[PDB]
């Protein structure tokens, strides 16, 4: 989908509603309500919430 | 916590308070733990560090007795450890012999000792607001 981000730091979360990820991971953004975004991992298709300051939007 | 950028700030909600207290209940570590200011600080800071909720939400109603959370959705309350007293039924001159608990020295600590207890009813019954509507307007 239109909005793709790359992780800048590891994000570990003990909570099932969060998407945990590794630095350098690519994700699709699904929702930008405030600063906690909903995302899907490009690699696993796993979905959840992410802290938007852990991530950078890229062109294409 | 290991060094990482602080996750974004947001105010506590009924739903976050519900989900996190359910998590704590299912993972263990909090149910049956003795309350202290320091243990609460740890809990508050952990929720802040992992999820971004500013730690100014976890207030409980004043004692004595059970302390109920002001945040509707948070399913832990603080329960006194000492068993609840059976006020009846005082005797005569020999009451100290029949009831050792009434001997001078056996008195409860001036500060009530408390333990965290999960209570599923806190999800639907806002006890703090029933006891203290003045906290909410």
From Swiss-Prot, chain A:
Modifications made to the protein after synthesis: Phosphorylated on several tyrosine residues. Autophosphorylated. Becomes rapidly phosphorylated upon activation of the immunoglobulin receptors FCGR1A and FCGR2A. Phosphorylation by the BCR-ABL fusion protein mediates activation of HCK.
Residue ranges annotated as coiled coil are none
Q: Which domain of life, per UniProt?
A: Eukaryota
Q: Which family does it belong to?
A: Belongs to the protein kinase superfamily. Tyr protein kinase family. SRC subfamily.
What is the protein's quaternary organization? Interacts (via SH2 domain) with FLT3 (tyrosine phosphorylated). Interacts with VAV1, WAS and RAPGEF1. This interaction stimulates its tyrosine-kinase activity. Interacts with ARRB1 and ARRB2. Interacts with ADAM15. Interacts with FASLG. Interacts with CBL. Interacts with FCGR1A; the interaction may be indirect. Interacts with IL6ST. Interacts (via SH3 domain) with ELMO1. Interacts (via SH3 domain) with TP73. Interacts with YAP1. Interacts with ABL1 and ITGB1, and thereby recruits ABL1 to activated ITGB1. Interacts (via SH3 domain) with WDCP. (Microbial infection) Interacts (via SH3 domain) with HEV ORF3 protein.
Which comment does the entry carry about domains?
The SH3 domain mediates binding to HIV-1 Nef.
Q: What is this protein's function?
A: Non-receptor tyrosine-protein kinase found in hematopoietic cells that transmits signals from cell surface receptors and plays an important role in the regulation of innate immune responses, including neutrophil, monocyte, macrophage and mast cell functions, phagocytosis, cell survival and proliferation, cell adhesion and migration. Acts downstream of receptors that bind the Fc region of immunoglobulins, such as FCGR1A and FCGR2A, but also CSF3R, PLAUR, the receptors for IFNG, IL2, IL6 and IL8, and integrins, such as ITGB1 and ITGB2.
- Disease entry from the Swiss-Prot or TrEMBL record: Aberrant activation of HCK by HIV-1 protein Nef enhances HIV-1 replication and contributes to HIV-1 pathogenicity. Aberrant activation of HCK, e.g. by the BCR-ABL fusion protein, promotes cancer cell proliferation.
Q: Give the protein name, as stated in the record.
A: Tyrosine-protein kinase HCK
Species name for this entry? Answer: Homo sapiens
Q: What is the lineage of its organism?
A: Eukaryota, Metazoa, Chordata, Craniata, Vertebrata
The gene is HCK
What portion of the full-length protein is represented by this chain? 79 to 138 of 526
Curated annotation (Swiss-Prot), chain B:
| Top-rank lineage group of the source organism | Viruses
Kindly provide the name given to this protein in its UniProt entry: C-terminal core protein
Renumbered residue ranges of the record's region SH3-binding: 2-11
Q: Where is this region: Binding to ATP6V1H?
A: 81-113
Q: Coordinates of motif Dileucine internalization motif in the sequence?
A: 97-98
**At which positions is motif PxxP?**
5-8
- The species is Human immunodeficiency virus type 1 group M subtype B (isolate ARV2/SF2) (HIV-1)
Q: Annotated region Mediates dimerization, Nef-PTE1 interaction: where?
A: 41-57
Return the motif ranges for Diacidic: 107-108
Tell me the name of the encoding gene: nef
Q: What is the lineage of its organism?
A: Viruses, Riboviria, Pararnavirae, Artverviricota, Revtraviricetes
């Amino acid at each position: 989908e239109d909005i793709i981000v790359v992780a800048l730091y590891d994000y570990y979360s003990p909570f099932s509603w969060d998407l945990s990820f590794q630095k350098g991971d690519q994700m699709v953004v699904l929702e930008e309500s405030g600063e906690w975004w909903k995302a899907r991992s490009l690699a696993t298709r796993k979905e959840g919430y992410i802290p938007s300051n852990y991530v950078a939007r890229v062109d294409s | 916590f290991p060094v990482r950028p602080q996750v974004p700030l947001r105010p506590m909600t009924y739903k976050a308070a519900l989900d996190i207290s359910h998590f704590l209940k299912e993972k263990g570590g909090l149910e049956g733990l003795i309350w202290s200011q320091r243990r609460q600080e740890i809990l508050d800071l952990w929720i802040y560090h992992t999820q971004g909720y500013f730690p100014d939400w976890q207030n409980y109603t004043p004692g004595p007795g059970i302390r109920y959370p002001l945040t509707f959705g948070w399913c832990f309350k603080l329960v006194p450890v000492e068993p609840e007293k059976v006020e009846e039924a005082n005797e005569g001159e020999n009451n100290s012999l029949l009831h050792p608990m009434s001997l001078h020295g056996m008195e409860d600590a001036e500060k009530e000792v408390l333990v965290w207890r999960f209570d599923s009813k806190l999800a639907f019954h806002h006890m703090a607001r029933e006891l203290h509507p003045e906290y909410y307007k």
